[PDB]
């Protein structure tokens, strides 16, 4: 038994809730929150900017030190950093950004990073301002992640569309 509440069961291991991932992280303080990162860990907008804002920019400060030491991530890759006030850890995962010309096949590789963690709070990857179809992202998630994933979908009209079209 874990502390996630109000989620709809999608599979044996995938759950989905119409909620704001930041407000969810603040309430649950999960072991792992996933950030929809870019390879530079530049948290301007989307989930990244919202998570970073909720950390009072501490996420960005830590991220800049990480990049200065290690260089950029790979598209499809990840790194584990602090969760600051939101979670024990933040798993920064780089899903391909369609609008930037990044290959969509890399979405499966991105979701494979989730399998290194028993339980995660996560957004959908590669959707929103990353430019790919959210129904597709949910399908890849369900077909790739084997650990327990709690998906927070803030967009009300999208949440309903994802549930109603889920096979």
Ligand X SMILES: Cc1oc(C(N)=O)cc1S(=O)(=O)Nc1ccc(Br)c(C#N)c1
Binding interface with ligand X (CB under 6 A) = 36, 46-47, 123-124, 127-130, 134, 153-155, 158
Question: Which residue lies nearer to ligand X by CB, 44 or 65?
Answer: 44
The CB-of-129 to ligand X minimum distance in angstroms stands at: 4
Q: Tell me the sheet residues that pair with 16.
A: 8, 151
Task: Give how far Cα 4 sits from Cα of 24, 43, 92, 98, 161, Å.
Answer: 9, 26, 21, 31, 22
The CB-of-155 to ligand X minimum distance in angstroms stands at: 3
Question: Which residue lies nearer to ligand X by CB, 30 or 128?
Answer: 128
The CB-of-108 to ligand X minimum distance in angstroms stands at: 17
The rounded distance, in Å, linking the Cα atoms of 102 and 145 is 21
Question: Which residue lies nearer to ligand X by CB, 19 or 81?
Answer: 19
Four-residue CA torsion sign, 166, 160, 136, 22: negative
CB-closest chain residue to ligand X: 128
The CB-of-1 to ligand X minimum distance in angstroms stands at: 26
Question: Which residue lies nearer to ligand X by CB, 81 or 122?
Answer: 122
């Amino acid at each position: 038994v874990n502390s996630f509440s109000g989620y709809l069961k999608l599979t044996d291991n995938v759950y989905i809730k119409n909620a704001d991932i930041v407000e969810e992280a603040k309430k649950v303080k999960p072991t792992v929150v996933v950030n929809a990162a870019n390879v530079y860990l530049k948290h301007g907008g989307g989930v990244a900017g919202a998570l970073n804002k909720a950390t009072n920019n501490a996420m960005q400060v830590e991220s800049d030190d990480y990049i200065a030491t290690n260089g950029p991530l790979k598209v499809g890759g990840s790194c584990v950093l602090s969760g600051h006030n939101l979670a024990k850890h933040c798993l920064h995962v780089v899903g391909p950004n369609v609008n930037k010309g990044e290959d969509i096949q890399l979405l499966k590789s991105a979701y494979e990073n989730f399998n290194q963690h028993e339980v995660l709070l996560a957004p959908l990857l590669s959707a929103g301002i990353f430019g790919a179809d959210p129904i597709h992202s949910l399908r890849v998630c369900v077909d790739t992640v084997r650990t327990n994933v709690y998906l927070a979908v803030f967009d009300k009209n999208l949440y309903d569309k994802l549930v109603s079209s889920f096979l």
